[PDB]
Design a protein around this ligand. Structure first.
Ligand SMILES: CCc1noc2cc(OC)c(NS(=O)(=O)c3ccccc3OC)cc12
Length: 131
């Protein structure tokens, strides 16, 4: 391991009692449809939890990525009704993807994984119900 255990940041928050939130049918769909389908995809597993820079030997990760996001966080945010609207959640997915494409080079296996999840994401977003 390039770096000691403990060198991960605290994960992104999944609750914030003073943050405004609302349940919308669009947020319900984000959980029930979008998250559940990407979650069980064969390429999801690197995205199901915060990047463990220690375990995975990416000691530079949190030098480069200052706004981390992952689908474990997003799943928790949806289940806990953290969001005010669908857009704040979509923002989280886009942040997760962009981080991957910033950190890695095009064609790297991790990027092909993210690209495939992103394709499916965008397909499922396409059918977002009207509020
Ligand atoms: C969002 C998770 C992530 N973003 O960028 C990464 C780069 C990684 O190692 C190259 C790893 N390491 S890994 O063992 O989880 C891994 C996953 C898929 C393909 C290759 C790979 O490690 C070489 C993870 C990420």
């Amino acid at each position: 391991h390039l770096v000691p255990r403990g060198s991960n940041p605290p994960p992104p928050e999944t609750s914030n009692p003073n943050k405004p939130k609302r349940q919308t049918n669009q947020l319900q769909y984000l959980l029930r449809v979008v998250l559940k389908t990407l979650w069980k995809h064969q390429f999801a597993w690197p995205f199901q939890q915060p990047v463990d820079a220690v375990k995975l030997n990416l000691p530079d990760y949190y030098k480069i990525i200052k706004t981390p996001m992952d689908m474990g966080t997003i799943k928790k945010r949806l289940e806990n009704n953290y969001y005010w609207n669908a857009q704040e959640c979509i923002q989280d997915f886009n942040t997760m993807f962009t981080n991957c494409y910033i950190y890695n080079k095009p064609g790297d296996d991790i990027v092909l994984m993210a690209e495939a999840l992103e394709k499916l994401f965008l397909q499922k977003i396409n059918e977002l119900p009207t509020e």
